Amino acid sequence: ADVAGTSNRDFRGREQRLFNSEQYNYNNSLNGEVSVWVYAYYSDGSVLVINKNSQYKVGISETFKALKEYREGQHNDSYDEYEVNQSIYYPNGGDARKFHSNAKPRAIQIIFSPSVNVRTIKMAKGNAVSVPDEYLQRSHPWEATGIKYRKIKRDGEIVGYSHYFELPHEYNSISLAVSGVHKNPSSYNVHNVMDVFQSCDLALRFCNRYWAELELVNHYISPNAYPYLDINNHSYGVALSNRQ
């Protein structure tokens, strides 16, 4: 046989480049996944991730309470934290024994897979009683925030999109939903509606609290080939198109 890495008959090299290209392109086909992650960062350094993976479109929606830190199998000050919630829902509404709950998120990162169409991204960032813009009567139910998403890139390829916003102020008390649609550069749509309804049942969810961004990088993002952007602006992910 020809010698490795010297001719156009290195079929092992050609098949390795096709294998990776086929994964990138499959994920962008309408047979592929679109995915979103919501990362809620806490002051003790831990991070709640919620991920949803589905065909055609995907989203996540959480109450104010559901985004607060919860330590499985440890003390969580549960009664005082009911009181904190009443004070956040309405000024002076609760009888808590603290000024600031450390279970409140300090920041949120939203990341989408590279198969989303950025122009279809919508966010409903609500107040603590789940109203998008002060009162229901004047609320548009979402904002299209795609222009704010940064490209997470590796070796020149877009591996995901990120929108990050801090919640560093005492009055930063939110409920949150986000949604994006999978790329569809074709004009095909008619005939597939019940398949989209089934995708709403088939979407898979994952939720976990990791103890540190380091642990998120090492045990969550990297083993699953997911995109990420860390606090030092370092991009993680795997470039696949035309690559060995």
Half-sphere exposure of 10 toward its Cβ, with a 13 Å CA cutoff? Answer: 11
Residue among 42 and 229 whose Cβ is closer to a copy of itself: 42
Residue among 115 and 229 whose Cβ is closer to a copy of itself: 115
CA distances from 112 to 8, 165, 171 (A): 37, 15, 27
Can residue 160 be called a binding residue for a copy of itself (CB under 8 A)?
A: no
- How far is Cα 238 from Cα 244, in angstroms, rounded to an integer? 11
Query: CB under 5 to 8 A by kind: which of Cl ion, a copy of itself, none does 130 bind?
Result: a copy of itself
Can residue 98 be called a binding residue for a copy of itself (CB under 8 A)?
A: yes
Residue among 28 and 229 whose Cβ is closer to a copy of itself: 28
Can residue 145 be called a binding residue for a copy of itself (CB under 8 A)?
A: no
Count of CB atoms situated within 10 Å of the CB of 86: 13
Backbone angles phi, psi at 73, to 5 degrees: 75, 10
Exactly one of 105, 110, 132, 162 binds a copy of itself (CB under 8 A); that residue is: 132
Residues 12-41 close enough to bind Cl ion by CB under 5 A: 29-30
Can residue 231 be called a binding residue for a copy of itself (CB under 8 A)?
A: no
Exactly one of 13, 17, 131, 154 binds a copy of itself (CB under 8 A); that residue is: 131
The interface region with a copy of itself, picked from 10-18, 149-157, 163-171, 215-223 by CB under 8 A, is 215-223
Residue among 11 and 196 whose Cβ is closer to a copy of itself: 196
Q: Least distance in Å: CB of 158 to Cl ion?
A: 19
Query: CB under 5 to 8 A by kind: which of a copy of itself, Cl ion, none does 30 bind?
Result: Cl ion
In DSSP notation, 34-85 reads EEEEEEEE-TTS-EEEEEEEEESEEEEEE-TGGGS---TTS---HHHHHHHH
Exactly one of 78, 186, 187, 233 binds a copy of itself (CB under 8 A); that residue is: 78
Can residue 58 be called a binding residue for a copy of itself (CB under 8 A)?
A: yes
- How far is Cα 183 from Cα 199, in angstroms, rounded to an integer? 15
Can residue 240 be called a binding residue for a copy of itself (CB under 8 A)?
A: yes
